[PDB]
Amino acid sequence: AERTGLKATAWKPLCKLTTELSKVSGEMLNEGQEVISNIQKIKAAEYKVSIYLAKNPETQALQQLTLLRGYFARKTNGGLESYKTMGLATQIRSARAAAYLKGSIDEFLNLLESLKGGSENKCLVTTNADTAATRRETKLDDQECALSMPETKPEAATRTELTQTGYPNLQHGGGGTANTFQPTTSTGTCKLLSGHSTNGYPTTSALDTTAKVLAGYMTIPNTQVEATLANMQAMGNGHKATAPAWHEAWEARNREAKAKDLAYTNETGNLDTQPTLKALVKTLLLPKDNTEHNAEATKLEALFGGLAADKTKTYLDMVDAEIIPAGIAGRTTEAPLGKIHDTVELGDILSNYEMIAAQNVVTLKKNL
Amino acid sequence: AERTGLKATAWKPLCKLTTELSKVSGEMLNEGQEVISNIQKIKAAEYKVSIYLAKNPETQALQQLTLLRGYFARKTNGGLESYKTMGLATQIRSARAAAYLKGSIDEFLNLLESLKGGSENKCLVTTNADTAATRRETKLDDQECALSMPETKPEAATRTELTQTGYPNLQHGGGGTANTFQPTTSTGTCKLLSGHSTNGYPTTSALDTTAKVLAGYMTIPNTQVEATLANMQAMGNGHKATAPAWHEAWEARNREAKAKDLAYTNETGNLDTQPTLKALVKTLLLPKEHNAEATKLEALFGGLAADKTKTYLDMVDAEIIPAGIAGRTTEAPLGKIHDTVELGDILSNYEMIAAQNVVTLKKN
Numbered sequence: 001a002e003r004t005g006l007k008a009t010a011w012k013p014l015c016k017l018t019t020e021l022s023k024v025s026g027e028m029l030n031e032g033q034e035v036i037s038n039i040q041k042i043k044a045a046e047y048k049v050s051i052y053l054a055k056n057p058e059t060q061a062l063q064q065l066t067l068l069r070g071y072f073a074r075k076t077n078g079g080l081e082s083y084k085t086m087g088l089a090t091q092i093r094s095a096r097a098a099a100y101l102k103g104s105i106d107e108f109l110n111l112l113e114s115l116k117g118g119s120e121n122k123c124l125v126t127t128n129a130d131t132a133a134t135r136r137e138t139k140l141d142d143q144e145c146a147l148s149m150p151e152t153k154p155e156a157a158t159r160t161e162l163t164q165t166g167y168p169n170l171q172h173g174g175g176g177t178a179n180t181f182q183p184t185t186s187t188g189t190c191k192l193l194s195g196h197s198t199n200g201y202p203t204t205s206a207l208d209t210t211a212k213v214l215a216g217y218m219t220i221p222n223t224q225v226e227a228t229l230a231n232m233q234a235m236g237n238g239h240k241a242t243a244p245a246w247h248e249a250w251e252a253r254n255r256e257a258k259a260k261d262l263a264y265t266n267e268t269g270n271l272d273t274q275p276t277l278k279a280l281v282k283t284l285l286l287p288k289d290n291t292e293h294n295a296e297a298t299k300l301e302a303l304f305g306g307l308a309a310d311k312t313k314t315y316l317d318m319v320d321a322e323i324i325p326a327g328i329a330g331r332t333t334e335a336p337l338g339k340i341h342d343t344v345e346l347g348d349i350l351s352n353y354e355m356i357a358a359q360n361v362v363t364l365k366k367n368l
Numbered sequence: 369a370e371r372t373g374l375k376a377t378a379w380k381p382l383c384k385l386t387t388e389l390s391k392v393s394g395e396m397l398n399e400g401q402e403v404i405s406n407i408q409k410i411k412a413a414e415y416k417v418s419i420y421l422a423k424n425p426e427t428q429a430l431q432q433l434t435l436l437r438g439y440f441a442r443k444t445n446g447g448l449e450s451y452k453t454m455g456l457a458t459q460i461r462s463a464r465a466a467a468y469l470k471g472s473i474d475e476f477l478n479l480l481e482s483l484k485g486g487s488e489n490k491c492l493v494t495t496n497a498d499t500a501a502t503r504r505e506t507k508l509d510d511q512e513c514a515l516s517m518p519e520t521k522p523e524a525a526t527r528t529e530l531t532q533t534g535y536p537n538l539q540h541g542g543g544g545t546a547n548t549f550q551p552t553t554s555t556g557t558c559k560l561l562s563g564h565s566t567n568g569y570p571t572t573s574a575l576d577t578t579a580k581v582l583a584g585y586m587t588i589p590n591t592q593v594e595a596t597l598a599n600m601q602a603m604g605n606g607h608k609a610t611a612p613a614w615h616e617a618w619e620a621r622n623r624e625a626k627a628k629d630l631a632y633t634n635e636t637g638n639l640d641t642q643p644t645l646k647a648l649v650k651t652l653l654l655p656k657e658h659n660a661e662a663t664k665l666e667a668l669f670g671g672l673a674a675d676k677t678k679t680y681l682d683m684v685d686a687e688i689i690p691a692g693i694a695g696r697t698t699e700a701p702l703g704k705i706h707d708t709v710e711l712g713d714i715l716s717n718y719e720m721i722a723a724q725n726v727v728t729l730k731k732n
């Protein structure tokens with residue numbers, strides 16, 4: 001009916017959504033940290049191969065290891081650039097889109113909760129006009145509904161309330177007298193939900209226009225009908241006009257950069273299909289006057305014994321086993337590269353071996 | 369004044385604040401971009417010195433350049449780690465804090481704007497009860513008041529509405545019948561602003577309690593008085609209880625990591641006062657007494673003035689990378705090569721040539 005409260009079938013999905021949205025910022029922190037961690041891990045790999053080369057100038061694996069060092073360098077350096085130029089924006093965009101939409105939901109729900117007055121005024125109701133939802137701490141009846149934003153810390157958010165498709169649990173309809181999301185008359189009423197003057201909010205004159213609230217989701221009529229709830233289940237371009245904050249949280253969520261993305265992970269598949277690897281074969285190893293078709297593939301087979309992805313493994317294993325003795329970079333005890341993961345530490349070790357490598361040349365040249 | 373509309377003196381500050389908050393996300397994007405940029409600059413310096421060493425093994429500047437190389441590496445690697453562990457959270461925090469607050473403000477302002485109906489219902493008024501503010505695109509009575517969020521793109525926000533101290537332009541007072549933020553009665557009314565049943569919103573019974581709206585800033589009474597506006601000018605711990613979203617945007621804004629912070633910038637001071645530089649003298653250069661690092665630095669650089677590294681850095685910058693290295697088309701000095709991907713390719717190629725040199729010297 002006109003001007004009864006909103007049923008729990010309509011507001012409980014909003015409580016679920018605000019609960020879900022509350023963790024998006026934190027999930028964006030977590031995802032950013034994992035992106036940076038991945039960049040770091042690839043930098044560490046660059047460093048390990050670099051250190052092995054500096055320590056072992058006479059290696060018989062010079063070309064294989066040069067290639068791999070170059071590969072990891074491109075991947076970490078390009079990854080960090082991609083995070084700056086594209087990735088970080090997606091994560092900030094989604095955190096703020098969720099937070100903006102959540103702020104409007106929380107404000108409107110709070111206002112409806114607050115318009116409770118004796119038997120005659122109740123806006124968040126259960127299944128009839130007379131029974132207000134009961135707040136107990138952060139719950140409204142049995143549904144978590146904390147109209148607050150938590151501390152930003154790493155989180156894993158739920159993915160049921162705002163999916164790839166849209167907002168599947170938000171109800172849609174209303175706008176007549178069917179008692180769909182506002183029950184039949186009894187005693188309690190929520191005049192805010194009608195902009196008509198006989199039984200609704202305004203004095204004497206109806207509202208000049210229908211009102212859009214909940215950032216465009218809900219229409220408050222200026223005629224003697226129920227509020228309308230828009231269809232948010234199948235989101236798309238048209239919501240940019242009718243419900244921009246809802247379209248924006250949806251699209252931003254779908255466009256989040258992930259640590260598992262191509263930009264921030266090692267390439268996969270056969271060696272000649274790893275585009276950074278293949279390009280570096282041509283950059284670092286081929287003569288500039290190479291005349292051959294598929295020269296990169298041929299060189300990779302000559303280097304690694306085939307094109308399967310696991311053909312690099314014995315080389316990376318050799319790097320990992322290499323022991324860095326106590327005394328390099330002030331280190332107290334020996335350790336194999338495979339146990340040293342800290343980028344600052346690895347940077348120090350590389351620095352020390354580049355000096356040692358220069359000293360080696362000077363000594364050689366001195367001996368003649 | 370019970371149940372008349374809000375004067376422009378009260379709501380225009382809210383418009384100003386939502387306008388300012390609209391750019392906070394984009395400023396945090398810019399800030400994070402500059403942090404990364406600074407980390408990349410230091411990395412580029414790490415690479416240039418490395419490349420110089422790989423190309424010039426007999427340099428008489430070996431110790432100086434090894435130290436600088438090591439310093440840039442600690443700085444850039446430590447910087448990125450600091451951004452992951454501490455900085456990035458500060459920036460996402462502030463973006464989302466501002467956005468959350470803005471979402472509440474925009475929703476409530478929108479509602480007030482929307483409760484306009486004939487001569488008798490007007491909630492955002494000018495200076496009297498009968499004159500509603502006029503919207504013209506993004507402006508309300510000529511004040512910017514776009515109840516929307518822009519695209520997230522790098523930009524700089526204003527700092528007049530949410531300052532280090534608080535919210536200086538938001539009014540405070542109300543709660544009686546002084547006509548302070550709601551004008552004397554005439555024909556227009558805003559019944560939402562009173563929770564008392566004779567002239568205000570609710571039918572028959574007053575609201576059970578006062579209502580807190582605008583995320584705690586505004587109190588709607590359940591007695592025959594004007595709304596109350598909280599004092600938000602000097603923020604502090606008391607606002608945690610009563611206006612937590614306002615406290616959160618304010619503290620988060622204050623705590624933003626900046627690209628100019630110590631974790632993302634070169635050290636300054638006399639050379640012996642630069643703690644990374646000093647530590648590395650011991651890590652990389654010093655065998656095994658008092659002031660040994662300072663003494664070594666002075667000898668290496670010909671003094672301890674901060675600019676005593678400049679000669680070494682200028683020599684690196686001048687080093688030409690000829691066409692043909694790492695597929696490059698043209699020659700350029702290191703000083704004109706800034707792209708970290710390109711620099712990593714250059715180092716890769718020169719370390720291979722360097723190892724080939726050793727193998728040749730040992731053969732001969």
Ligand SMILES: *[C@@H]1O[C@H](CO)[C@@H](O[C@@H]2O[C@H](CO)[C@@H](O[C@@H]3O[C@H](CO)[C@@H](O)[C@H](O[C@H]4O[C@H](CO)[C@@H](O)[C@H](O)[C@@H]4O[C@H]4O[C@H](CO)[C@@H](O)[C@H](O)[C@@H]4O)[C@@H]3O)[C@H](O)[C@H]2NC(C)=O)[C@H](O)[C@H]1NC(C)=O
Nearest residue numbers: 406409410412413416633634681682684685686701703704
């Ligand atoms: C931390 O500190 C490091 C070290 O200082 C920073 O790394 C250097 O960063 C700068 C970029 O900011 C980079 O490029 C130089 O930038 C200067 C302009 O901003 C230029 O002065 C310099 O160019 C000179 O040398 C070129 C190559 O020789 C010349 O072609 C050019 O014409 C300039 O030459 C003039 O200047 C020299 C010396 O003053 C003098 O002989 C004549 O006037 C000459 O005509 C570069 O483009 C450096 O390459 C970086 N240094 C290294 C060693 O990598 C890092 O950015 C800092 N980090 C942060 C966050 O600030």
Ligand SMILES: *[C@@H]1O[C@H](CO)[C@@H](O[C@@H]2O[C@H](CO)[C@@H](O[C@@H]3O[C@H](CO[C@H]4O[C@H](CO)[C@@H](O)[C@H](O)[C@@H]4O)[C@@H](O)[C@H](O[C@H]4O[C@H](CO)[C@@H](O)[C@H](O)[C@@H]4O)[C@@H]3O)[C@H](O)[C@H]2NC(C)=O)[C@H](O)[C@H]1NC(C)=O
Nearest residue numbers: 038041042044045048264265266316319320321336337338
């Ligand atoms: C891109 O790819 C590089 C190259 O693989 C990765 O760098 C390696 O990262 C690993 C894991 O941190 C480093 O540590 C060593 O891992 C080896 C196994 O690595 C593979 O399997 C793990 C688990 O699935 C993957 O996470 C990893 O990506 C690899 O696929 C272990 O075998 C090593 O231990 C062995 O060696 C030491 C010494 O010989 C012994 O003490 C052990 O008992 C054991 O025999 C070790 O744990 C490894 O050092 C890195 N390699 C190099 C060259 O740096 C990057 O992490 C990856 N980047 C991303 C984002 O995935």
